[PDB]
Design a protein around this nucleic acid. Structure first.
Ligand code: SF4
Ligand SMILES: [Mg+2]
Ligand SMILES: [Mg+2]
Ligand SMILES: [Mg+2]
Ligand SMILES: [Mg+2]
Ligand SMILES: [Mg+2]
Length: 429
RNA sequence: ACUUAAGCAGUGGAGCAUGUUAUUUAAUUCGAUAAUCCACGACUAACCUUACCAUAUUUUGAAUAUUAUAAUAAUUAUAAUUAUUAUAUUACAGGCGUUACAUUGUUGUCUUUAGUUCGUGCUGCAAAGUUUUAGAUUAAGUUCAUAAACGAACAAAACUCCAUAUAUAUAAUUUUAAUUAUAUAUAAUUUUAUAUUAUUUAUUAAUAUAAAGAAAGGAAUUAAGACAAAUCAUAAUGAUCCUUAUAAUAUGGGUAAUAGACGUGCUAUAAUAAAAUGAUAAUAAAAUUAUAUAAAAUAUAUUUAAUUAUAUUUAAUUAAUAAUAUAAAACAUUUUAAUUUUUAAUAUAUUUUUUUAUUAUAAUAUGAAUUAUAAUCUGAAAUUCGAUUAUAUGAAAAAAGAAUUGCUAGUAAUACGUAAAUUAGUAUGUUACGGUGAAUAUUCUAACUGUUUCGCACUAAUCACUCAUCACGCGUUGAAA
């Protein structure tokens, strides 16, 4: 008789396992890999994996046509999955009705990977005005991107550079905010300034990258640069911030204060004292297509470099920012909401606005034992909390808790609400 | 130089068993997630185990101590004291709560372990160095050589213990396997004599030949780094959290649900291979039996008996004594679809279990999953959810391939079996034990390690330092209508 709350379902993130469009996977396997003997493709894929294995390493533009083949065979799946989950995250937390973008930009090394994901998410009936997609690594990536996009129903405009005469209300960035290990502080600033100028009012910008500690640091720095939390102390809740310009965070951060998990230098994770550090990443599962299963085979990709699965667990970190509309109404609303609204010090245990924009963030796998579930949350109070929900406290609320996973916004109250210790090894750096 | 390349032996498309994953579930107890690949402990999950779900149900509970009332004793003298035993008594006990809660202990994985300190001696003004040598030899630290170096301690080696061959002792050869058993002891790292080729040229290695030999294998045994851990079920202590609940008991359920996905094994796909039979009993080893084992016999399947499975009944043995238990492959005969390569009627023969002549004459008699009936074993209980027997069933499985396992050896393989642990009951799993017993040679590739050469503005040591840029101030000097 006991069932999940509608509030919990609203807070729940998308759960079902991912999968490529059958037409897209069939086309990829039939064309992009059939004409090439598998061994050389596996060799180049092994090279790319080995050169990204280094700690705090980066993705790299496809120099050569063989590298283009390898990237579509190996790395396109996880980019597509990350885009799928982040885009559905945006779609749910802005509401299905309000998410109807018409001017679209995708920026990424691979094919128009956000464009195919957008087509899949908004169905085959969505036909917006502009579907620009700039491709960087190689010119031949455009050809195979056209091969992918032909099977999905072209109007999409495959370019090699950003048009510099138009704004955009949907923008997707895939591994775009940092290209060199050096200049990590504000080269992200440079990139985000370049992409932020072409984002229309009411538009969406969706950033996604690797989800390793270097990744999480890039996300944290980008958020800090955009928001300037230090410029707005004691301002709890989500209000758009100046940066006639205003922007707000949607996900995965349920506040706009300093990130509790941020330590400035990624190299701290490599030391013998930063091995206990924790970074904000998110996990998803995606079914392995045939060409993937046919690829990871042999001593190159199937052995231990010193049972399998039909799916891959991809890690990723991401951000989403919404633009405020340009109008005297919106401007005055922002100014007054900052002026006379004393939202108060959101105390440990506070849910903030008790809506989607401010519900806590599950950032770790909850520990579910008989009669109690423990959750590690990033709360709208700007802090890192540990919330324990017991059956004695409430049966319905415990029932909701035991079905909660990492990456859900858990929307209700708990019995115990203490300061979580995940940031213990942060101040000492 | 791991690992690769080669050679050999395989396994490898199906069914089932057993795991993990996904999904579902009231629960399907617990395990991984920084992009090759990896959530994967089972010496037995029906109940218990059990940790999960549902419903009831217990509240100082498992212990230590305190302070009190009741009985029991012992003493003194009913009372005093001691103890014991209950009932309360509150600190609390308890916790398969937490590693995003840490540190030791350890548990493993990888690298280096002829090398690290110490003491002297010597060289340099000194920081330092300890030199030839960055040597030779071997399959490898297994062995030498040299030189301002030489020592001791650990480590390694030797040594030790197995196995093997012998000697002594022991056994009144009925506990008999004296072909054995277990104590002590010896032996080998084999020793030699020549020939040839190399050699630092003999007082040396490669071989080969001859001689004495039973002599041919094996394990263990140390530290230093570095990574990984919470079924870290390889623990302790501490931190924090629950204290009508995250502690505790009972009933039932679940851990066995299936669209799927991948590992591990068992059974198969027929003739260099399966089936039946083979009583004066072809031939073992290592084990186990007081919380047992179960012999022979009788009876029913069932049928003259045999075999196989239960039932009745306990003979010996608690053991070098009796039982588990007549080891099986091996070997002999017979049969075996595809196969008109066969069987049958007539004749026929110096092939007679046989030959000739004329007519007739894609899944089988492989496979045993699945399904049905009726019985049986354990246990109190076999529905979810065990094993066994008989009578019906009779699926997929044929061709070629990705892929991968192991590699001189009593090893692989074996339609060869035997035994033990866990068990009241269930092994296609694990660990032991013996029987038969092969093949093949290694161009190649190599991370990585060890020495080295050169450079060095770095020294908390390239995630280094220096240089230049951008803003903010404070100064200084030089020209000046
Ligand atoms: S959710 Fe919290 S921990 Fe994660 S990036 Fe945002 S602020 Fe940081
Ligand atoms: Mg029970
Ligand atoms: Mg049970
Ligand atoms: Mg305690
Ligand atoms: Mg418990
Ligand atoms: Mg048969």
């Amino acid at each position: 008789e006991l069932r999940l709350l509608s509030k919990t379902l609203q807070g729940q993130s998308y759960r079902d396992q991912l999968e490529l469009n059958p037409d897209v996977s069939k086309a990829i396997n039939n064309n992009i890999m059939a004409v090439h003997i598998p061994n050389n493709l596996r060799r180049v894929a092994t090279n790319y994996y080995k050169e990204i294995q280094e700690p705090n390493s980066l993705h790299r533009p496809c120099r050569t046509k063989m590298e283009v083949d390898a990237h579509i065979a190996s790395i396109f799946l996880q980019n597509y999955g990350s885009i799928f989950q982040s885009l559905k995250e945006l779609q749910k937390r802005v509401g299905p009705d309000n998410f109807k973008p018409q001017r679209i930009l995708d920026v990424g090394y691979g094919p128009a990977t956000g464009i195919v994901a957008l087509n899949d998410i908004l169905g085959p009936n969505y036909r917006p005005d502009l579907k620009d997609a700039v491709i960087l690594g190689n010119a031949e990536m455009q050809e195979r991107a056209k091969i992918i996009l032909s099977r999905q129903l072209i109007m999409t405009n495959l370019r090699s550079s950003i048009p510099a005469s138009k704004e955009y209300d949907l923008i997707i960035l895939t591994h775009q905010l940092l290209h060199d290990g050096n200049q990590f502080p504000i080269q992200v600033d440079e990139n985000i300034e370049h992409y932020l100028n072409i984002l229309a009012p009411g538009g969406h910008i969706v950033i996604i990258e690797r989800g390793n500690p270097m990744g999480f640091e890039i996300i944290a720095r980008a958020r800090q640069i955009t928001l300037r939390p230090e410029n707005f102390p004691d301002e709890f809740g989500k209000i758009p911030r100046p940066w006639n310009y205003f922007l707000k965070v949607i996900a995965p951060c349920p506040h706009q204060r300093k990130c509790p998990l941020q330590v400035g230098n990624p190299n701290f994770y490599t030391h013998k004292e930063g091995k206990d550090l924790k970074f904000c990443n998110f996990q998803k599962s995606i079914k392995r297509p045939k060409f993937s299963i046919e690829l990871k085979k042999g001593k190159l990709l199937a052995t231990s470099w010193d049972n399998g699965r039909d799916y891959e667990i991809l890690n990723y970190s991401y951000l989403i920012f919404e633009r405020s509309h340009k109008d005297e109404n919106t401007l005055k609303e922002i100014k007054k909401l900052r002026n006379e609204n004393v939202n108060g010090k959101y105390d440990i245990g506070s849910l903030g606005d008790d809506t989607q924009n401010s519900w806590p963030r599950i950032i770790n796998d909850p520990v579910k034992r008989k009669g109690h579930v423990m959750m590690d949350l990033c709360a709208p109070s700007g802090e890192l909390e540990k919330w324990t929900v017991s059956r004695s406290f409430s049966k319905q609320i415990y029932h909701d808790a035991r079905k909660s996973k990492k990456g859900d916004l858990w929307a209700s109250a708990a019995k115990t609400q203490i300061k979580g210790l995940g940031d213990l090894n942060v101040k000492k750096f």
